[PDB]
Amino acid sequence: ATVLLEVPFSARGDRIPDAVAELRTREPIRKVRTITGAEAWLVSSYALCTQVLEDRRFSMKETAAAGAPRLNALTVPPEVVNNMGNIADAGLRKAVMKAITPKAPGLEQFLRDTANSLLDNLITEGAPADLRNDFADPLATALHCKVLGIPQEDGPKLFRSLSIAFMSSADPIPAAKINWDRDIEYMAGILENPNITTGLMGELSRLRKDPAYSHVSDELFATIGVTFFGAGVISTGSFLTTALISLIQRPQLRNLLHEKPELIPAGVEELLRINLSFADGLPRLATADIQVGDVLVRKGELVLVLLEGANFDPEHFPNPGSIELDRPNPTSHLAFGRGQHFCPGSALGRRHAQIGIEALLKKMPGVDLAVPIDQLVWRTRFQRRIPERLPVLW
Numbered sequence: 086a087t088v089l090l091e092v093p094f095s096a097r098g099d100r101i102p103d104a105v106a107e108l109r110t111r112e113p114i115r116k117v118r119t120i121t122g123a124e125a126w127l128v129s130s131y132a133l134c135t136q137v138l139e140d141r142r143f144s145m146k147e148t149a150a151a152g153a154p155r156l157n158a159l160t161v162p163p164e165v166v167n168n169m170g171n172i173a174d175a176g177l178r179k180a181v182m183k184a185i186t187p188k189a190p191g192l193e194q195f196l197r198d199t200a201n202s203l204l205d206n207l208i209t210e211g212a213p214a215d216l217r218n219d220f221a222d223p224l225a226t227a228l229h230c231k232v233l234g235i236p237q238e239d240g241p242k243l244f245r246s247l248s249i250a251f252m253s254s255a256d257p258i259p260a261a262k263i264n265w266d267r268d269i270e271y272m273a274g275i276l277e278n279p280n281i282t283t284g285l286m287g288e289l290s291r292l293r294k295d296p297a298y299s300h301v302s303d304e305l306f307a308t309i310g311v312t313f314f315g316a317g318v319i320s321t322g323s324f325l326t327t328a329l330i331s332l333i334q335r336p337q338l339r340n341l342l343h344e345k346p347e348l349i350p351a352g353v354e355e356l357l358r359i360n361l362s363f364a365d366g367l368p369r370l371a372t373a374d375i376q377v378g379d380v381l382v383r384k385g386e387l388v389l390v391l392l393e394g395a396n397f398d399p400e401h402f403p404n405p406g407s408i409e410l411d412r413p414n415p416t417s418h419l420a421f422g423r424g425q426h427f428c429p430g431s432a433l434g435r436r437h438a439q440i441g442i443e444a445l446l447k448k449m450p451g452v453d454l455a456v457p458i459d460q461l462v463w464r465t466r467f468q469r470r471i472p473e474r475l476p477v478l479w
């Protein structure tokens with residue numbers, strides 16, 4: 086006698102389980118059990134993943150409803166699941182999206198300077214170096230302090246909330262509320278701090294005192310800062326970390342991008358496509374009865390959109406495990422989602438990874454793992470897949 090298939094399948098972020106391909110072929114939508122004990126529909130083909138993400142009747146905000154089947158416990162207030170919707174309703178979407186583009190004057194130069202300084206420090210200390218804790222994550226943190234307009238020295242403390250904030254837990258997490266409340270208090274103080282005049286928080290601080298926004302809540306302004314810092318830092322840091330592994334595992338790609346750095350954007354796009362940083366499918370709750378493939382999903386049921394299901398689907402990306410810089414459909418992957426909730430930080434995430442990789446390949450052309458790849462320790466019960474340390478030599 087066998088139990089219902091459990092998700093997630095593996096916390097390892099360096100390879101996709103052979104099981105995903107068998108599942109996509111045989112049952113591209115099928116029932117699974119989540120860590121909470123709830124049942125859910127796991128969707129694993131490109132066609133069905135796109136269908137779900139483009140149909141707003143599969144709702145993100147409704148996943149936070151009391152009594153719904155859950156992928157994991159909330160680590161944020163329930164109203165925060167609707168964060169982008171609240172931003173839009175407050176009239177703040179254009180201003181927020183403008184503040185988080187990589188086009189702001191000096192931002193890209195700051196990123197390059199920061200990456201080079203981090204790498205110089207590692208070279209001075211000598212191999213082995215930890216490219217997650219001493220490169221990718223500090224680069225992500227520095228970037229988001231700059232984007233938010235907050236002091237660089239405040240980055241590390243905000244960062245240390247994230248190993249709990251992005252847990253994927255069966256049960257509520259007491260530490261998540263402690264850190265959330267503290268970080269909200271911090272951002273509320275930032276909005277009242279007259280020295281904060283640049284970046285996203287500088288812009289929100291101005292709009293907060295503009296008569297057109299006088300009824301927008303101080304809670305929402307603070308929440309934007311906390312959530313954009315957290316989502317951005319965890320997403321860019323984790324993506325860059327696992328992209329570096331994928332590059333290290335491919336010496337000839339590493340050498341091609343070192344020799345022809347103009348190919349780095351196309352390389353980053355393929356690294357995004359094959360990336361396994363999202364540890365769970367994207368959750369949606371059905372608000373109606375909806376046919377998805379051979380399954381009639383019923384109102385109130387949980388659907389999980391498996392990004393690597395779509396992104397390794399050979400019907401859409403032939404030879405899907407191979408990084409090919411000349412695909413005809415290179416940005417059509419789902420690494421940033423699709424539809425209503427498409428990632429607002431997609432351009433910034435691309436530039437973070439492009440600049441980080443360019444800098445690493447220039448400073449450490451001989452970069453290689455300093456331990457056998459099986460020795461990487463993969464974080465469990467987390468919303469991202471990441472190795473606890475990434476030891477390299479060069």
Ligand code: HEM
Pocket residue numbers: 145169170185312313314316317318320321324367368419420421422423425426427428429430431433434435
């Ligand atoms: C490579 C880096 C990144 C990746 C791979 C990534 C991935 C994603 C994905 C897949 C979603 C869709 C989630 C869903 O539909 O359920 C998403 C949404 C989001 N991302 Fe990103 N992201 C990245 C960088 C960033 C950055 C830099 C920020 C902000 C600074 C950010 C903020 C957000 C926010 C706020 C949402 C929710 C948007 C909404 O609900 O409409 N992300 N991200």
Ligand SMILES: Cc1cc(O)ccc1C[C@@H]1NC(=O)[C@H](Cc2ccc(O)cc2)NC1=O
Pocket residue numbers: 160161165166168169250251311312313314315316320
């Ligand atoms: C737990 C948390 C702590 C934070 O500090 C910020 C945001 C999350 C939520 C978590 N993060 C994500 O990257 C995606 C996409 C997403 C949804 C809503 C959102 O506001 C931002 C992003 N979904 C999530 O459920």
